[PDB]
Amino acid sequence: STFGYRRGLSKYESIDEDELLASLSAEELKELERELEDIE
Amino acid sequence: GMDAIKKKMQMLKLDNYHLENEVARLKKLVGER
Amino acid sequence: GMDAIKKKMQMLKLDNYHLENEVARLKKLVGER
């Protein structure tokens, strides 16, 4: 089935959220978690 | 922690997926393929 | 560094706004609104 190419996948399945955050410093991870208040 | 960043990113991707599924519904109801 | 990821997450709230506006426009066109 062709539908498996998108059923259960967003418009942005191009990097894993484990690997996206992987290289940040401890003060960057703090200031990036603070951004979640502005995003909501 | 970084788990909240992962959760909010994956939640925004799920909201985007629900909206793409609603646009896909409405496009099909307009007589598309 | 992380500032590029801040902007990447803020962008998803704007894509979801473009999508909600298109959902509203198509619900108008197909008479569901």
Curated annotation (Swiss-Prot), chain A:
Show the segment(s) annotated as Interaction with tropomyosin alpha: 1-40
Q: Cite the record's tissue specificity text.
A: Specifically expressed in heart and skeletal muscles, with higher levels in heart (at protein level). Not expressed in other tissues.
Q: Which positions does the record annotate as the modified residue Phosphoserine?
A: 10, 14, 23
* Superkingdom of this protein's organism: Eukaryota
Q: Where in the cell is it found?
A: Cytoplasm, Myofibril, Sarcomere; Cytoplasm, Myofibril; Cytoplasm, Myofibril, Sarcomere, M line; Cytoplasm, Cytoskeleton
Coiled-coil residue windows: 15-40
What disorder is listed for this protein? Cardiomyopathy, dilated, 2G: A form of dilated cardiomyopathy, a disorder characterized by ventricular dilation and impaired systolic function, resulting in congestive heart failure and arrhythmia. Patients are at risk of premature death. CMD2G is an autosomal recessive form characterized by early-onset, severe cardiomyopathy that progresses rapidly to heart failure in the neonatal period without evidence of intervening hypertrophy.
Q: What's its job?
A: Mediates nucleation of actin filaments and thereby promotes actin polymerization. Plays a role in the regulation of actin filament length. Required for normal sarcomere organization in the heart, and for normal heart function.
Q: Can you tell me which family this protein belongs to?
A: Belongs to the tropomodulin family.
Binding partners and assembly: Can bind at least three actin monomers and thereby provides a nucleus for actin filament formation. Interacts (via N-terminus) with tropomyosin alpha (TPM1) (via N-terminus). May also interact with TPM2 (via N-terminus). Interacts with FLII.
Protein name from the UniProt record:
Leiomodin-2
Q: Which organism is it from?
A: Homo sapiens (Human)
From Swiss-Prot, chains B, C:
- Please list the residues that carry the modification N-acetylmethionine: 2
Q: Which tissue types show expression of this protein?
A: Detected in primary breast cancer tissues but undetectable in normal breast tissues in Sudanese patients. Isoform 1 is expressed in adult and fetal skeletal muscle and cardiac tissues, with higher expression levels in the cardiac tissues. Isoform 10 is expressed in adult and fetal cardiac tissues, but not in skeletal muscle.
Give the source's domain of life in one word. Answer: Eukaryota
Enumerate the subcellular locations listed in this protein's record, separating them with semicolons: Cytoplasm, Cytoskeleton
User: Self-association or partners: how does it assemble?
Assistant: Homodimer. Heterodimer of an alpha (TPM1, TPM3 or TPM4) and a beta (TPM2) chain. Interacts with HRG (via the HRR domain); the interaction contributes to the antiangiogenic properties of the histidine/proline-rich region (HRR) of HRG. Interacts (via N-terminus) with LMOD2 (via N-terminus) and TMOD1 (via N-terminus).
Associated clinical condition: Cardiomyopathy, familial hypertrophic, 3: A hereditary heart disorder characterized by ventricular hypertrophy, which is usually asymmetric and often involves the interventricular septum. The symptoms include dyspnea, syncope, collapse, palpitations, and chest pain. They can be readily provoked by exercise. The disorder has inter- and intrafamilial variability ranging from benign to malignant forms with high risk of cardiac failure and sudden cardiac death.
Indicate the family of this protein: Belongs to the tropomyosin family.
* Domain remarks in the Swiss-Prot or TrEMBL record: The molecule is in a coiled coil structure that is formed by 2 polypeptide chains. The sequence exhibits a prominent seven-residues periodicity.
Its job: Binds to actin filaments in muscle and non-muscle cells. Plays a central role, in association with the troponin complex, in the calcium dependent regulation of vertebrate striated muscle contraction. Smooth muscle contraction is regulated by interaction with caldesmon. In non-muscle cells is implicated in stabilizing cytoskeleton actin filaments.
**Name of the featured protein:** Tropomyosin alpha-1 chain
